[PDB]
Amino acid sequence: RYKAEIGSVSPTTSRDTFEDHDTCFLGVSLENSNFKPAKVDAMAKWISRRFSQCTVLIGDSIHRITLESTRSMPPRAALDDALRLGREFVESRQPVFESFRDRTKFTFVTCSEVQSWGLYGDYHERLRQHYDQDAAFRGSVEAFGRDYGVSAQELDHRIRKSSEYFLEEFAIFACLQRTGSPVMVYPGSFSTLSEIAQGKHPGAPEELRDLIVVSLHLKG
Template identity: 30%
Template sequence: MTITTDASIDISIEASFEVLPFTRTCRHIWEDGDHVLIGVSPGNSYFSAERVAALARWASERFAQVDFVYADLHVDRMFAAFGYTREHAERRAAKEIKAVRRRILKGVSESLDRYSGIRVRGLSEFQEDPVYKLLHRRVLHFLEADPEFRKGCERMALHFMGTKVPEGESITTEQLQVCFDYIAAELPFFVDTPSILDVPSSVSAYHVDMPLTEVLYARGGGLRAMRNQAYAVVRPEAPAREVPAATEGNGDERRAA
């Protein structure tokens, strides 16, 4: 699924990262610079210690507060649903979670010679937080009661987990449910990070488009991101591309970036 942004939103390229706020409001929140939350997935080679260090330095120059939150809930169940024995799934999940936490801490520590106050936490640390628990219950409610939201969650599950399904097979009901649980644990931070972390406004940043973003930020009803919650794709700056010269009689119609 291709997520479209407001055509009036320009793409900014700052330092070594490219920033694509999803809506005009998301851009305004980005410009406010109150807070950014960088979500990190275990087992994702994108989040090397070097990449985390670059993100930490870059984000600290632009935001008053920076949080890294990594997914550490339902990871063992994900492995089990895709064929691992329970014991092997638990060992593999523990290894992946430990590794991603180590990489984040290493990357952040490398940036602390200039920046401080960056927080690193797992999703499990919020399980008893009353605001997080309330938001999580809302997510689960809409997952059952809102067909459009559920379809968005299905697209997100297939987007991230489809490669793990053997060719010619479909994702099973059990696998889909585990994916839902994994996604639901993350979604409170896409809906209302300011209330969870007590910040004026917040940008949830990830390096790829999320299939649920359009549901949370673009539609008129159902589960919606709060007004002071933003989403932006933040990814390494693409190599500079050559721009062909305008031909006679045709102006350069590129939108300024």
């Protein structure tokens, strides 16, 4: 069993105004231990006290990138697997969320659905361009992927691919931010989003500058 509490809030100034909103989104990563059924229960609970509507964003299509890299899977397997794992999560966890239908309506939306939106194209293109044309923003984004006896040209490749994950995901986050869900809930932080909100990448999309990310901490 677990108890969720505010770990952190970006921007800092939004740490005491975010609860004025009545709608949020919860970003779900797949095959991720922060989304075990019990943890999902504590996060839905914390959400149920603050928010009457919650989009549960399932990171399915973006998970294809993770599976290609870390498990070597070929293009079709990686996407069919990523979508299946998404379906399995919805089917597994959906009772956990319905336990709270008294207080919060949880709607599931997939990353693949939002990627069919024209907005995703607009946002993703602006983000990739700024990645290509701005060293400071590029370095912020690739900071996670620089976790990675492997050649220099190969390692670069894997840093790049891992950073393509974040550009897909940040564009999807901005899509939700601008379409009724200005607060994001996630059990973790995103340094790049944080710096953008604190005004450190002024050429990064405004839409991410207005995003509010509540980083939850899960304890037993």
